[PDB]
C-alpha cells in the first residue's frame, strides 16, 4: 500500500498547513487537559490523551501510510523497538546520514525527553542541518506540525518509509 512521494509530499503539506486529511485534526479550538495548552485548529491528537503530542504526528501518519493496519504503541524511543511492515527500514544516525522527505526522525539522546522526541523530515537538507515537522517541541502540546530547522542533535534514529 506504500505511497508516492508526490502523496508523500502532499500529505506533509496539509499537516503543515492545518488542512490534511485525518480524523485525528483538531477542527475547532479544543482543551480536555489544563495541564497543556489549548490545542488550535490543525493539531493531530491520535490518542485523545495529552493533547497534541510528538507522538500523535507519526501514529497518525504511519497510519495513513499503512491504509490504518498498524498503529503505533509507546512514545518516540519505542518506535525503533517496533516495526510498521514491510518498506520500513530503521537507519542509525551517523554524521554522513542525510535522510530523505517523509522520513520519520528519532531523538533519544541529548538534552531530549526520556521518552524521546519524533517528527518527521520534511526536508532532507544536508550533513549540517535538515527541515523536520514535528509537534509539541514547546513541549505545551497545542500546536500544529511546526517546521523546525535541525541540527542532528540528539537525534538517533531515522526510520525510512516506502515510497511507490
Ligand atoms: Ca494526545
Known sequence: MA?????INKR?????????????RIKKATSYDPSFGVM?????????????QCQD???????????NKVRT???AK?????????????????????????????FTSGSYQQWGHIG??????????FTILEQNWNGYANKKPTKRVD?????????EIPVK
Open 151 to 159: 541540527n542532528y542533535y540528539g537525534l538517533t534514529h531515522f526510520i
Open 12 to 24: 506533509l503539506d496539509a499537516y503543515a498547513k492545518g488542512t490534511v486529511d485525518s480524523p485525528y
Open 3 to 7: 505511497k508516492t512521494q508526490a502523496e
Open 57 to 67: 504526528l507519526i501514529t497518525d501518519y504511519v497510519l495513513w501510510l499503512t491504509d
Open 120 to 129: 518527521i523530515v520534511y526536508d532532507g537538507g544536508n550533513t549540517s542541518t
Open 73 to 75: 504503541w509507546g512514545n
Open 78 to 106: 519505542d518506535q525503533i523497538k517496533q516495526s510498521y511492515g514491510t518498506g520500513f527500514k530503521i537507519h542509525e544516525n551517523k554524521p554522513s546520514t542525510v535522510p530523505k522527505k517523509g522520513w520519520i526522525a528519532v
Open 40 to 52: 488550535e485548529a490543525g493539531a493531530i491528537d491520535a490518542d485523545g490523551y495529552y493533547h497534541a
